[PDB]
Amino acid sequence: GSAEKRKPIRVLSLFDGIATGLLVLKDLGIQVDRYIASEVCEDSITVGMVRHQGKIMYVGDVRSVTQKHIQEWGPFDLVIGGSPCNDLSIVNPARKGLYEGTGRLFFEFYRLLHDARPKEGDDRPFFWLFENVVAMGVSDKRDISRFLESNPVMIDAKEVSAAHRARYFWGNLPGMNRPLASTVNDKLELQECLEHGRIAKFSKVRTQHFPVFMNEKEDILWCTEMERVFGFPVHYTDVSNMSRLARQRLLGRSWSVPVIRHLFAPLKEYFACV
Amino acid sequence: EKRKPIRVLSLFDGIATGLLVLKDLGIQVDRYIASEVCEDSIGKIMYVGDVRSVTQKHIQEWGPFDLVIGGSPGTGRLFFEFYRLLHDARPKEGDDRPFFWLFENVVAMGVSDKRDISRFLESNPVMIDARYFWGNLPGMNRPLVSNMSRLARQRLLGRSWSVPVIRHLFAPLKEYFACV
Amino acid sequence: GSAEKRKPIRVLSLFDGIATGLLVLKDLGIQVDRYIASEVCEDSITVGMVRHQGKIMYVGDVRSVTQKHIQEWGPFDLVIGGSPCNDLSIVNPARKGLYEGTGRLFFEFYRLLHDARPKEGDDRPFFWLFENVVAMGVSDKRDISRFLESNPVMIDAKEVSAAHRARYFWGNLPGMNRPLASTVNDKLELQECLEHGRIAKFSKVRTHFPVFMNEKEDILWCTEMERVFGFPVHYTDVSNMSRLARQRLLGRSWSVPVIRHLFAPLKEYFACV
Amino acid sequence: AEKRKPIRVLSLFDGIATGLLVLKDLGIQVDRYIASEVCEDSKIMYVGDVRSVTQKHIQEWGPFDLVIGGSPGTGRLFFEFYRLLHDARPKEGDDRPFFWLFENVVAMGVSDKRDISRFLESNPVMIDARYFWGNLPGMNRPLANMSRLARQRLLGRSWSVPVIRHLFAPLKEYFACV
Ligand SMILES: Nc1ncnc2c1ncn2[C@@H]1O[C@H](CSCC[C@H](N)C(=O)O)[C@@H](O)[C@H]1O
Ligand SMILES: Nc1ncnc2c1ncn2[C@@H]1O[C@H](CSCC[C@H](N)C(=O)O)[C@@H](O)[C@H]1O
């Protein structure tokens, strides 16, 4: 209810990956004051460094971050995160659940988020977002919704991209449950994402079939095609001499860019826009 | 500005243990609410059931709380519930009122779990030969037809296994809360 | 001496690799009527197919190409080629020479070129080019110059790029020996070719660890190597290839500014966009 | 189109004047016989190393009617022979007779055999053993206080048997005979 110049957003991104959040914020025209990211995979760190010109401040393991660190590096306006899910997904029979293995990393989020929320009486806008997979134990989803005091929103990237990617999103971002908008930049069909000389079998691709035909033979998706599918700029992940398995793994763990765009869009009215 | 009876929140295995130690040390109790993990399925003293039913608003209403205890003499599930209850019961920034907590577990745990608990609680444990005891209590600062009323009900029940030597850890509470 | 409308160039590229010739011809604004390429590496074929929208007519092994094929697919205006040099380079001690191993592939060129030369009395412009390495046996170089009836021109890509790549070029292209032009697009220094957050140790790469990133040492990335050799960034980013495959394809490739320098005079002989 | 004239031969075959001897055996008039030989390093003539022979030399000494090469690594020999053949071949539109023959040993890499058959566009003639490629009528094959002292040995041994001569027999139906 007061007057002031809208200021650039301050972001804390845990489990940053290939810095999808910063890319989405840049694409929206939102000015980023600073972007502190916690990531351990060196390949993802190299991707972020090269593609965002070192603007990202890397702090390493999320478990090396203390509350004193959150207050000194802070304040923060937006806290985003997507913890690893190899111990949360039901497709893994050796899953250790939300509380053991790599699932317990989620609590780190719940830790730092509570270390980052404005103290009582601070009416400043503060937003947070936590993404994970839909294919998890109902006990684990109920426990996450208990710890975050919010119910998740289910968004499938197939509605805005060419990939069957349904994900749960907890958070307090404005209008998370609002209908997604299919714009013109959205490549809804897999054929739109393929390189020249290839033909797509299905309309959408899933994370035993090889989806593309090339000449007289069958083939899996290329990394550039996978980038177009997930909404990333072409050759986004073309750094660091990493193996093809490395690029495919990095893109597999990544968020769908149009989905995160849909989620981050309402932030344009709360911060400075270039 | 004057001593008042203690208010406790217990996630420990066995609702009795904490209140028993408190009555042993002779500390007045104005509120004691207990809950269990119950991971399988779903005036002063009260039992509230599954911890999965206890919300932040419940801690607010039942509160304020002065002591928060947890643990047991699957090691990750109960500690994180205890951490959530601690965060929900902590006094807000700017409330210098006393607030203590204690978490007991077995020494036979994964070293990863021990390091994680020490990190999350910002405190190093107390070894008692053997159990680990984390806490902010003074002294726990550590460096690095026509028959019986009873009838069977088909359940196993726990007990209070800790001796008054473990209550010696709680002993400093007598200097912070009213004693009868 | 007569009048006619300039027509698009017809090209025959043997040992095409990654269509360095087609890319150079497109960059120069020269209209390409037809581009028939002979290449056997499937990775290179995929690169050339994807990057040029299937404009390339791939005929496979150069040894499955006959003289009747040159007449029926012809006429051709330009014939370019760069045979493999693993049996020509003095670095390899197990080299088999020009006449054995993979060196004899050169003769295939010498074959098809003579199968594509305009017959006597045909005053039409016809150009050819054959590239290979400088580090070869003096006898093999003398033999190649004897077979092609031309002395080679030595061009080192270090003069217009950031790579110590000196090569021999035989051919009849106009003014091959003319001085090269260092333009503004030329990234002469290895630093200009690096991705963000890396520092170059040497001014030009000779392919130890050429770059320093943060506190560690590292070799050149594929995009950096593309910038070094004059290729557009992410040119070779198709086909789920292994990193070794990308480094191998870029190693065997021509330096783009050098081929541009060689092909530039062709603008006054054919139709230009 | 006109009366027969003597034959003119260009010989790179290992062993000099072997073809001259065979032509003398078959009684064919020879108006020119130029002979050369491949070397490791530096009206009937021997012109030395084939590396010194150019297209202009083939034009001056020419025209040629027969081109012979081979030996009773194999690549260098055949490829020098191919260069000489290409330089001596009549241009398109010249229907004048022009024959060639290339002999090698059967003991060769099968890759080399197929490469020679491809380059010469001809399948070989096996003779109990040597391989003979040629365009002579009959070789068409389907798909399979004394003077001498102190010098580096110059043994001119070369096999010119009647069967080998037989291959050259059709030549007497195209050129003048003494
Ligand atoms: N202990 C830890 N601290 C910080 N990051 C971690 C971590 N353990 C795993 N990670 C990283 O967290 C990532 C989760 S996958 C999510 C990545 C991100 N949401 C994106 O869209 O790119 C993984 O890439 C993994 O490298
Ligand atoms: N027998 C053959 N027929 C056709 N191409 C061949 C071949 N043997 C090898 N090659 C190809 O010839 C290439 C020679 S390296 C030269 C590549 C090209 N000049 C460029 O600039 O990209 C190699 O990539 C190899 O794949």
Residue numbers in the entry:
A (entry chain B): 626 to 832, 846 to 912
B (entry chain E): 629 to 670, 679 to 709, 726 to 781, 791 to 805, 877 to 912
C (entry chain A): 626 to 832, 847 to 912
D (entry chain F): 628 to 669, 680 to 709, 726 to 781, 791 to 806, 879 to 912
Task: Quote the paper.
DNA methyltransferases DNMT3A- and DNMT3B-mediated DNA methylation critically regulate epigenomic and transcriptomic patterning during development. Here, we report the crystal structures of the DNMT3A methyltransferase domain, revealing a molecular basis for its oligomerization behavior distinct to DNMT3B, and the enhanced intermolecular contacts caused by the R882H or R882C mutation.
To provide the structural basis for the homotetrameric assembly of DNMT3A, we crystalized the MTase domain of DNMT3A (residues 628–912) with the SAM analog S-adenosyl-homocysteine (SAH) and solved the crystal structure at 3.3 Å resolution. The DNMT3A–SAH complex was packed in the P3 space group, with each asymmetric unit containing two DNMT3A tetramers. In contrast, a larger extent of structural disorder was observed for the two external subunits, with residues 671–678, 710–724, 782–789, and 805–879 disordered or completely untraceable. Among these, residues 710–724 constitute the catalytic loop, residues 671–678-situated α2-helix is part of the SAM-binding pocket, and residues 805–879 encompass the DNA-binding TRD. In this context, the observation that the TRD and SAM-binding pocket assume structural order in the RD interface-present central subunits but become disordered in the RD interface-lacking external subunits implies a coupling between folding of these structural elements and integrity of the RD interface. Of note, residue R882 of DNMT3A homotetramer and the corresponding DNMT3B R823 are both solvent-exposed and peripheral to the RD interface. The two central subunits of DNMT3A homotetramer form an integrated substrate-binding platform resembling that of the DNMT3A homodimer within the DNMT3A–DNMT3L complex, whereas the two external subunits abrogate their substrate-binding sites due to the lack of a folded TRD and cofactor-binding pocket.
